[model samples]
Target: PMILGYWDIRGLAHAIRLLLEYTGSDYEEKIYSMGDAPDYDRSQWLSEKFKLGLDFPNLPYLIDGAHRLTQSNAILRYIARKHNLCGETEEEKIRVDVLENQAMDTRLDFARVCYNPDFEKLKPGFLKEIPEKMKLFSEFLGKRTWFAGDKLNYVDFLAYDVLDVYRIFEPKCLDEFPNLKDFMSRFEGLKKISAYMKSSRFLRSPLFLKMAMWGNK
Candidate 1:
């Protein structure tokens, strides 16, 4: 069983969790307390790393048996490959990689504006840029069933989760993107994900979810 150290809110870990769900892999989601970094818990991390001969300086680290992996993008790619979430064909797999990278670029930009130190005072300008990008992305997704591969893939899952997080920082963010909005709604309607959402252990925190909504607003 793999153990994933994550935050409660929709961050990097959210995408990983979705990927795991998409792959239907058995793993443990260990949510960590938020605070100043390096003060969270050194002993536990050190002990685990020492036992495994690894280094973990951040959250979202995945521990699979004796092997440890870090870096969210790398971890996602590795997991996707391991679980055959890359796609059925070579071309499809390559497309998955391309779409995932493209979507990740947008996510990084969104995070910069949402989490930047000077974001508050500079929000107007930041918010202004989003609409243009959203319009472009919407058009790009127009009438397309999926971003990559015929069936659901890691790219779509990451894009969906990442955009959802962006909407947390900016409400009504996807209003103009009808295609994207529909895609998310449809994706959530999937049987497996729907069940997971309704499960008792589903850890969608109201405080964090509300914060994301208001922050985006």
Candidate 2:
């Protein structure tokens, strides 16, 4: 079976998981937890990391037969290519890549605010910049059904996930961008995605909230 190694939280693996689910792929997740210890235990993963033969072993790695893949985006792309969701043509593929990277940058920015030690101090600036950042995507999306084109691509998953993360902080974040809001609803209505959202395995909250020294609460 395909094995995904990561922490118990969704983190960077959620989109990849969404891809796997949408493709109906059978994969098992090996989720490591902090246990009763004060700090996260790196021993479990570190001990097995070198055995996987990865040059740069890390968490959130995927093991499919003899193929070992690391990096969340690389893993997502691998699954996407396997399922023919990358894009239809070279041009579309390039567009998908650009949009996916942009969405990831947005997610990282959201993370910076959520995980910051001084969240209250950073909240104002972050809130102010969010609409502008979201506007860029709304403009890129324009009247399209998806970020890439008419059909769903790998980047759409990334874009939706990033937007969903932001929505957690600001429920009305997408109200101004009707196109994005529609895009999100369209993605969520997918049979598999909808089911996953209601499933017990889906994490509605951050897994490492207490681990962060600051504003997650």
Candidate 3:
């Protein structure tokens, strides 16, 4: 079992946690205090754990016996492959990779527009630019049950989590992408994921939530 370093807000780490839950995998998630980011001891702890003797200096690194993996997308691919979440056929698998690339781009774009210091300046551009991207995604997803194939796959889980975070931060920014909204709604309705959403341990930290709540203010 892997032990994940958790954060207060539903940031990058949450998606991995969601993946773990979705696959019904047993792993440990240790929530770090975002309120105490300046704590020297905590920093020291992470530094020590992330030395050359250990893995790289990162929060979302995965530890599995002799193998230590870093990077979110790589970690996701590892987990998905391990759990047989990649998809059935070669074409479906290729489609899965394509969707993951699309999701990654969308996630980065959203982050830039929402979290950057110049976010306010960029928001207008995003409002004008993202609809086309969203439309592209919606068209790709049109009349499809999942991104890869009829059944759910790793891309679906990853995309759904990203969309959920976007919706939480931006509300109806997804309205133009009706198919995406429907896809997201359907993904969240999965029994395992729905249960995870209800778990108190899975909720974001109130402190981060407060910060996010004032993002536009």
Candidate 4:
């Protein structure tokens, strides 16, 4: 079994966790919690950071035997390759690659605004851009069954996560884009994914640490 370590929140690790469950990977979570209020102390994770043998130690790391790795995308690809979900054909690979990076960009921006101290002031500007960003994704997605053509690649997991985040940010965000809503429902309808959603371990909140202004429950 592999060990996946991250904070006890729903951030970068959510997509990775989804992929893990969907692929039926034998794994366990090492969820760390930051102290509440005053300090938000992170010794829970920092104490084990340097000792984990990770080349670039960070949260959302995976240790598969001796292969300790950090970075969410790397962890996603590691499990993805094992299950042949990285993509096969050249066209699919290209689509996966594009969505992989693009999703990260979106996630970063989402975090940036949430973590900013001026969240109340910045929220509107960010919300105003959602449609354009979503439109770009809609254009990219077209009417495909999955993000990368007919196959469900690792990027699909990433895309699903970001889309889910946006929809939660604004419940009606997807009402205008029926195809994206359809895509969201389709991804959620998967056997493993649907089952995971119903499982005891499923977490749909606390989207970030206490420091973030939004979804930090």
Candidate 5:
């Protein structure tokens, strides 16, 4: 079984967690908490990171025997490839990668706003741009059942997770995009995913909510 180490938050670890759950992979997560202290305490993992023998150690790192992996997308790619969730063909896999890249860019922007100290100042601009960007995704999705096509690829999880976060910011975010709304519902209805959604492990809010602009306000 592989061991996933990350903060006790949805943050970058949520997508990875979804992939693991969907694949039915045998793994354990080592969740660390940021105590009530005013600042983040890296001593918990940073002190032992280098000792783990990883070439480039960081949070949300995965350890499976001699194989150590980092970076959220890289980890997702690795797991998806391992579990045959990437795609059926080389071109399909490339398309999957491309969608993940697109989703990641939008997701990062959402993160910037949510995590920014001046979210109120930034909110208006984000509100204007985000829906348009989301429509781009809806158009790309078009009539396809998933981002990569009719099949549910790993990129769908990434897309769903990203949009799910955005939905928190604006509840009606997906109302105008019928395709994306259907896509999200379809993904959520998956047996494994639905089960996970009902489980205690699936946290509805970020663990470090107080640190986020959305939480602060």
Candidate 6:
């Protein structure tokens, strides 16, 4: 079975988890504990956990049958390639690649605000920018049933996660984009995804780890 390792937050692990369940993959989660302060627990994860030959070690990694890998997208693509979810057509692949980087930009920006020491000071600015940030995605998504057009691919999982994080951060942001909201509902309505969401293993809260100023539960 594949082992998914990360902190007890949604973070990068969210989309991957959704994808795993969606694909009916053999996997289990290893939610490492940080206990109290940030420094205390990361050492062991960085040290003892991967003497098993993880070529490039990091948190939120996936190890399937001695195949040690890190970098969340790398892991996602690895899993995606296995299931033929990397997009079929040339256009779909191109869109997925573009959205992959774009999603990271959004995710990183959001995290910067959330994890900042001056979170309250930054929150308003971030919130104000949220709609504008989301609009491009809405425009790109347009009338397509999925982000990559008709077929559901790995980027959709990542995109789902990015949009969801934004929505959670600014609850009313999606009200302006009906198509994006519909996309959310449509993605969640999937049989496997819906089932995982309903299950106890679903990790929906504490969007960041203990170090973050917001959603750190």
**Which one is best on lDDT?**
4
Tens-place lDDT per residue, model 6, 96-206, is: 999999999999998998889999999988888989999999999999999999989889999999999988878999999999999999999999999998999898987
Identify the runs in model 2 with alpha carbons over 4 angstroms from their true place.
35-38, 207-209, 213-217
For residues 1-217, could you state the per-residue lDDT of candidate 1 as single tens digits?
Answer: 8888766555677778777776777898766544433454445444444454446556668888776777787778778878776778887777776767777788777666555657677788878877776776677556878766357777778778766765765778898888889989977887777777787756553323223323422
Ordered from best to worst lDDT, the candidate numbers read: 4, 6, 5, 2, 3, 1
lDDT (0 to 1) per candidate: 0.69, 0.81, 0.70, 0.91, 0.83, 0.89
CA error at residue 23 for candidate 6, angstroms: 0.3
Q: lDDT tens string, model 2, 1-217?
A: 8998887666788888888889989999987664443765676666777887776898789999888999989999899888888788787888897988887788887777667779778888988998998899899999988877888888988888788888777888899999989999999999999998899867655624445533233
Alpha-carbon RMSD, each predicted model: 3.9, 2.0, 3.3, 0.8, 1.8, 1.4
Model with the higher lDDT, candidate 1 or 5:
5
Regarding TM-score, does 3 or 5 come out ahead?
Answer: 5
Cα lDDT over the full model 5: 0.83
**Sliding window of 10 residues with minimal summed lDDT for model 1:** 207-216
lDDT of 3 by residue, 104-178 (tens): 888877765555667667777777775676677778777889888688787887778667756666677698777
Lowest-scoring 10 consecutive residues by lDDT in candidate 3?
A: 207-216
* Candidate 1 Cα RMSD (Å): 3.9
lDDT of candidate model 6 versus the reference: 0.89
On a 0 to 100 scale, what is the lDDT of residue 191 in model 6?
96
* Candidate 3 C-alpha error for residue 115, in Å: 3.6
Q: Choose 1 or 2, whichever is better by lDDT.
A: 2
User: Candidate 4 — which pairs collide?
Assistant: none
TM-score leaderboard ranking: 4, 6, 5, 2, 3, 1
| Highest TM-score scorer | 4
Task: Quickly count the clashes in candidate 2.
Answer: 0
Q: What's model 4's TM-score?
A: 0.98
User: What's the true lDDT of residue 71 in model 5?
Assistant: 87
Candidate 3: C-alpha RMSD after superposition? 3.3
Tally clashes: model 6: 0
